[PDB]
């Protein structure tokens, strides 16, 4: 589980850019305010390699 990857981001990455932000993603209208609940998904997932 040590290898992760970003799945949700507000905008596209310009070439040769690093983005290590771990803030919650707001895919809806209501603010997340720091909870990964309704319409609020954590932007990093895991490569469960086996």
């Amino acid at each position, epitope marked *: *589980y*040590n290898y*992760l990857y970003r799945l949700f981001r507000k905008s596209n990455l310009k070439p040769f850019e690093r983005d290590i932000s*771990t803030e919650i993603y707001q895919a809806g209208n209501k603010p997340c305010n720091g909870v990964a609940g309704f319409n609020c998904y*954590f932007p*990093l*997932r*895991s490569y469960s390699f086996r």
Partner: nanobody
Framework: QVQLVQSGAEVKKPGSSVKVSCKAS????????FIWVRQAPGQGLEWMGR????????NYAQKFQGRVTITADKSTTTAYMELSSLRSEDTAVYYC??????????????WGQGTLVTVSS
């Protein structure tokens, strides 16, 4: 940089449950993995489970299934371990360990002082 603080010694009846708290201070709490180790008074170390808070997956040992539960709290940055159906041989030293994202999640980088929990009448 990062230090671990555990609770005090516990003396409990066989028909009860034990909760152990573990406080971690230093760095970011999102990239931390928590692992608990049990050490018998006269024998070696014993692993039961590993918990990831950031991805929210949990796992426990085969012989502690349904009896042990490890939880992580973001607000106060603590890890809680709950064990039910205690027995006489459960008296041992419980260790709280922490791992980093850059390092292996399954390995333990930092260790706490440990809590000595004893079961008697």
């Amino acid at each position: 940089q990062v230090q671990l603080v555990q609770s005090g010694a516990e003396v409990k009846k066989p028909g009860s449950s034990v909760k152990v708290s573990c406080k971690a201070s230093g760095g970011t709490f999102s990239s931390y993995s928590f692992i608990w180790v049990r050490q018998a008074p006269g024998q070696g170390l014993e692993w039961m489970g590993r918990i990831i808070p950031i991805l929210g997956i949990a796992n426990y040992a085969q012989k502690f299934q349904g009896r042990v539960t490890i939880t992580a709290d973001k607000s106060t940055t603590t890890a809680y371990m709950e064990l039910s159906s205690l027995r006489s041989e459960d008296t041992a030293v419980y260790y709280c360990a922490r791992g980093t994202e850059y390092g292996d999640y399954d390995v333990s980088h930092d260790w706490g002082q440990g809590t000595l929990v004893t079961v008697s009448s």
